[PDB]
Design a protein around this motif. Structure first.
Motif, mmCIF file in Angstrom:
data_model
loop_
_atom_site.group_PDB
_atom_site.id
_atom_site.type_symbol
_atom_site.label_atom_id
_atom_site.label_comp_id
_atom_site.label_asym_id
_atom_site.label_seq_id
_atom_site.Cartn_x
_atom_site.Cartn_y
_atom_site.Cartn_z
ATOM 1 N N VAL A 52 -7.033 -2.294 -20.684
ATOM 2 C CA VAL A 52 -6.410 -3.143 -19.682
ATOM 3 C C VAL A 52 -6.083 -2.218 -18.502
ATOM 4 C CG1 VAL A 52 -4.470 -4.606 -19.099
ATOM 5 C CG2 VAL A 52 -5.428 -4.738 -21.367
ATOM 6 N N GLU A 53 -6.586 -2.544 -17.314
ATOM 7 C CA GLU A 53 -6.302 -1.753 -16.115
ATOM 8 C C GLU A 53 -4.943 -2.108 -15.638
ATOM 9 O OE1 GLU A 53 -7.788 -2.886 -12.285
ATOM 10 O OE2 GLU A 53 -8.010 -0.860 -11.578
ATOM 11 N N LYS A 54 -4.765 -3.294 -15.130
ATOM 12 C CA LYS A 54 -3.549 -3.794 -14.584
ATOM 13 C C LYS A 54 -3.176 -5.150 -15.098
ATOM 14 C CE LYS A 54 -4.428 -1.160 -10.390
ATOM 15 N NZ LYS A 54 -3.213 -0.398 -10.070
ATOM 16 N N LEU A 55 -1.890 -5.449 -15.113
ATOM 17 C CA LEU A 55 -1.321 -6.786 -15.212
ATOM 18 C C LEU A 55 -0.531 -7.132 -13.976
ATOM 19 C CD1 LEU A 55 -0.013 -6.678 -18.905
ATOM 20 C CD2 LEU A 55 -2.049 -7.877 -18.094
ATOM 21 N N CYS A 56 -0.709 -8.323 -13.430
ATOM 22 C CA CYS A 56 0.204 -8.883 -12.425
ATOM 23 C C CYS A 56 1.142 -9.755 -13.254
ATOM 24 C CB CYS A 56 -0.593 -9.678 -11.370
ATOM 25 S SG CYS A 56 0.521 -10.681 -10.345
ATOM 26 N N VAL A 57 2.432 -9.512 -13.157
ATOM 27 C CA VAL A 57 3.403 -10.221 -13.962
ATOM 28 C C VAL A 57 4.497 -10.804 -13.124
ATOM 29 C CG1 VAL A 57 2.927 -8.683 -15.888
ATOM 30 C CG2 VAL A 57 4.986 -8.253 -14.490
ATOM 31 N N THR A 103 -8.834 -16.139 0.022
ATOM 32 C CA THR A 103 -8.953 -15.674 -1.380
ATOM 33 C C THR A 103 -8.958 -14.148 -1.529
ATOM 34 O OG1 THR A 103 -10.184 -17.654 -1.685
ATOM 35 C CG2 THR A 103 -10.389 -16.049 -3.438
ATOM 36 N N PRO A 104 -8.150 -13.655 -2.488
ATOM 37 C CA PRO A 104 -8.087 -12.226 -2.679
ATOM 38 C C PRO A 104 -9.335 -11.642 -3.327
ATOM 39 C CG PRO A 104 -7.017 -13.352 -4.494
ATOM 40 C CD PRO A 104 -7.347 -14.395 -3.464
ATOM 41 N N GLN A 105 -9.502 -10.349 -3.175
ATOM 42 C CA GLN A 105 -10.643 -9.642 -3.761
ATOM 43 C C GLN A 105 -10.343 -8.755 -4.951
ATOM 44 O OE1 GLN A 105 -13.633 -8.284 -1.179
ATOM 45 N NE2 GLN A 105 -13.034 -9.702 0.421
ATOM 46 N N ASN A 106 -9.070 -8.640 -5.295
ATOM 47 C CA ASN A 106 -8.645 -7.810 -6.449
ATOM 48 C C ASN A 106 -7.295 -8.272 -6.886
ATOM 49 O OD1 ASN A 106 -6.554 -6.309 -5.004
ATOM 50 N ND2 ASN A 106 -8.309 -5.583 -3.786
ATOM 51 N N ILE A 107 -6.919 -7.823 -8.092
ATOM 52 C CA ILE A 107 -5.674 -8.247 -8.736
ATOM 53 C C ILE A 107 -4.413 -7.863 -7.951
ATOM 54 C CG2 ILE A 107 -5.503 -6.147 -10.206
ATOM 55 C CD1 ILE A 107 -4.456 -8.041 -12.405
ATOM 56 N N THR A 108 -4.428 -6.753 -7.209
ATOM 57 C CA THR A 108 -3.230 -6.278 -6.483
ATOM 58 C C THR A 108 -2.999 -7.215 -5.320
ATOM 59 O OG1 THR A 108 -3.546 -3.990 -7.230
ATOM 60 C CG2 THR A 108 -2.337 -4.311 -5.203
ATOM 61 N N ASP A 109 -4.064 -7.559 -4.610
ATOM 62 C CA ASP A 109 -3.951 -8.464 -3.492
ATOM 63 C C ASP A 109 -3.595 -9.879 -3.916
ATOM 64 O OD1 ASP A 109 -4.536 -6.147 -1.980
ATOM 65 O OD2 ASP A 109 -6.567 -6.904 -1.442
ATOM 66 N N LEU A 110 -4.152 -10.312 -5.068
ATOM 67 C CA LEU A 110 -3.812 -11.595 -5.609
ATOM 68 C C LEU A 110 -2.333 -11.644 -5.976
ATOM 69 C CD1 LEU A 110 -5.857 -13.568 -8.208
ATOM 70 C CD2 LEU A 110 -3.407 -13.442 -8.467
ATOM 71 N N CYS A 111 -1.905 -10.582 -6.642
ATOM 72 C CA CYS A 111 -0.521 -10.479 -7.062
ATOM 73 C C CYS A 111 0.442 -10.595 -5.890
ATOM 74 C CB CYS A 111 -0.303 -9.174 -7.852
ATOM 75 S SG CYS A 111 1.096 -9.243 -9.005
ATOM 76 N N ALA A 112 0.052 -10.021 -4.762
ATOM 77 C CA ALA A 112 0.902 -10.040 -3.553
ATOM 78 C C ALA A 112 0.997 -11.413 -2.901
ATOM 79 C CB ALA A 112 0.417 -9.020 -2.530
ATOM 80 N N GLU A 113 0.206 -12.403 -3.331
ATOM 81 C CA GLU A 113 0.295 -13.766 -2.819
ATOM 82 C C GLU A 113 1.386 -14.580 -3.468
ATOM 83 O OE1 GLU A 113 -3.851 -15.178 -1.245
ATOM 84 O OE2 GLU A 113 -3.989 -14.802 -3.349
ATOM 85 N N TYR A 114 2.241 -13.976 -4.304
ATOM 86 C CA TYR A 114 3.308 -14.689 -5.024
ATOM 87 C C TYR A 114 4.603 -13.950 -4.926
ATOM 88 C CZ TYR A 114 -0.537 -17.229 -6.940
ATOM 89 O OH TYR A 114 -1.693 -18.014 -7.029
#
Ligand SMILES: CC(=O)N[C@H]1[C@H]([C@H](O)[C@H](O)CO)O[C@](C(=O)O)(n2cc(CCC(=O)NCC[C@@H]3O[C@H](CO)[C@H](O)[C@H](O)[C@H]3O)nn2)C[C@@H]1O
Ligand SMILES: CC(=O)N[C@H]1[C@H]([C@H](O)[C@H](O)CO)O[C@](C(=O)O)(n2cc(CCC(=O)NCC[C@@H]3O[C@H](CO)[C@H](O)[C@H](O)[C@H]3O)nn2)C[C@@H]1O
Ligand SMILES: CC(=O)N[C@H]1[C@H]([C@H](O)[C@H](O)CO)O[C@](C(=O)O)(n2cc(CCC(=O)NCC[C@@H]3O[C@H](CO)[C@H](O)[C@H](O)[C@H]3O)nn2)C[C@@H]1O
Ligand SMILES: CC(=O)N[C@H]1[C@H]([C@H](O)[C@H](O)CO)O[C@](C(=O)O)(n2cc(CCC(=O)NCC[C@@H]3O[C@H](CO)[C@H](O)[C@H](O)[C@H]3O)nn2)C[C@@H]1O
Ligand SMILES: CC(=O)N[C@H]1[C@H]([C@H](O)[C@H](O)CO)O[C@](C(=O)O)(n2cc(CCC(=O)NCC[C@@H]3O[C@H](CO)[C@H](O)[C@H](O)[C@H]3O)nn2)C[C@@H]1O
Lengths: 103, 103, 103, 103, 103
Positions: C82-87, C1-12
């Protein structure tokens, strides 16, 4: 149908009215299994729960139980004064049946 | 039934209490498949998740998981002080079981 | 499991991080059939959608898609940064996967 | 997929864009059977409905209809500027298909 | 389809309009079984209920009843001016069918 919280509370065994006239001091909620509940406290020390749904509840209560936790969270966050609680006193913490807000 | 977050937390294996006494620094949520989750952080560097629902969860927890993400979003947006988190420490980030909020 | 939105985003696949550090400029939503969607924009011209639920989504995403629209609406109305969006960048408008908010 | 309300609105027969650039003047909702609906007005005298759910509506619209009433209520209460409404003009009051909010 | 609360109200037997032009004075809700209901009062003493769901309701009303309780709670908490209520006067407390809010 009752006219107010006090008369509603009197329609049930094992209940009593508390008159807080105060905002909620603390709000707690849990997603832990078998403890899907909320606990609130007031500055006078009183502690109340929204009970975990159980075999004592009838089906029509389930949505109301969810609504009550919604109410308590927003009341906490808005610092809304709680007038009275109708609670079951055969549980510890005493279990919320109804809430009134005013003033 | 427990009367506070600390005693509730101690009813489970692999949990502990963190004491923050601070508002949430950042709120993250995802709809990406297999990562339907929320992550919060605090200024002191603590990072916590609301886990993706799975087979470890019993059915009564599902609604409560959704409620928790609702709570964290609104707590973030209202800058509400989080008092304590009870978390599972056998997940990374540590997984939120319960939250308490007070002034 | 990721710890932040950037790392989560990189799982796709077919994703990317947009860094906004800004409030939402406009919020649009539709109930028209086949276009049950939300669109947000930022003052820099950037346009993003929450996709119509579809065949590509797995069942667990359905609730999270509804939650994301709830989140965007209240973010808009409270002028939350809004800081970031993963899109996903293989859709037009780019389709929101995740959001982070921070002061 | 459209990138704004005007282009979305144009994908349907019997619709038109109303440009309000104003907050909602009044919000009405009903739970009366066969009139489970909302009506909003603007100070220029314009009146719009969210239709009672009916066989005109496809399954995917049902959740979006309920979201739309949620959006209008909170828009009203926050005095949010409504930019445009996409409406069906073959109903009286004209029936909301989509909303955009911007300053 | 009606264009305002007064006209909607007149589409039912056993109804009348009350003109309040005031915020809600008190909000009460109950999760007690067979009394899953809300009661509001205004400063003039007038009492109104959102009825417990019953045989008299058609299925399409069930979501709307829940919505109305949501509306009344947020109206209360925001101190939103209630313009009119449409109520059934064959119940006591009189039962809310519709609400209008305007400043
Ligand atoms: C307005 C109304 O219908 N009131 C009646 C209620 C009511 O029907 C039930 O509580 C609905 O489940 O049932 C009453 C009551 O006082 O609760 N009732 C029920 C019973 C036998 C079963 C019983 O006590 N059910 C309620 C258990 C209580 O549930 C509560 C939650 O709803 C609490 O958890 C409480 O701690 C628990 O003791 N005997 N009297 C009689 C009362 O006249
Ligand atoms: C108040 C109460 O009922 N507490 C009991 C809990 C509880 O029944 C379960 O956690 C509910 O699913 O079950 C306990 C517990 O500590 O979790 N339990 C359960 C078990 C065997 C199955 C088991 O470990 N279930 C919990 C898995 C945990 O689920 C958690 C989410 O709810 C987390 O994802 C955590 O990372 C995971 O290890 N052994 N002890 C014993 C504890 O006394
Ligand atoms: C954390 C995790 O599980 N990540 C995996 C994801 C994921 O399992 C799926 O996206 C969830 O449905 O599936 C990945 C992915 O990158 O999406 N995946 C899936 C596939 C085959 C099916 C596939 O492409 N599904 C995703 C479609 C995308 O859906 C998205 C919505 O969720 C968007 O609409 C996007 O425009 C669309 O391309 N190949 N790689 C691999 C990645 O490792
Ligand atoms: C983006 C998209 O898919 N647009 C298409 C829409 C759409 O598929 C349907 O409206 C969804 O139900 O269907 C279109 C449309 O313009 O509505 N359509 C549908 C039909 C036959 C059925 C039909 O008229 N459905 C819409 C009825 C309208 O429903 C609306 C609510 O959704 C309103 O109540 C409106 O007053 C009513 O006339 N003929 N054209 C063609 C258009 O290309
Ligand atoms: C717009 C519309 O369709 N209005 C019609 C309504 C309506 O169809 C029903 O109330 C919906 O269930 O049904 C009307 C009405 O006045 O309620 N109606 C219904 C009937 C017979 C059955 C009946 O009275 N149902 C309503 C019972 C009322 O339910 C209400 C809640 O919905 C209240 O609890 C009220 O206290 C109760 O008497 N006779 N007239 C005729 C009216 O023209």
């Amino acid at each position: 149908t009752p006219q107010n919280i006090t008369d509603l509370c009197a329609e049930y065994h094992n209940t009593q009215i508390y008159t807080l006239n105060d905002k909620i001091f603390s709000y707690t909620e849990s997603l832990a299994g078998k403890r899907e509940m909320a606990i609130i406290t007031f500055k006078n020390g009183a502690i109340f729960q929204v009970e975990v749904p159980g075999s004592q509840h009838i089906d029509s209560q389930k949505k109301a139980i969810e609504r009550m936790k919604d109410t308590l969270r927003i009341a906490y966050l808005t610092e809304a004064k709680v007038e009275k609680l109708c609670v079951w006193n055969n549980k510890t913490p005493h279990a919320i049946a109804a809430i009134s807000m005013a003033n």
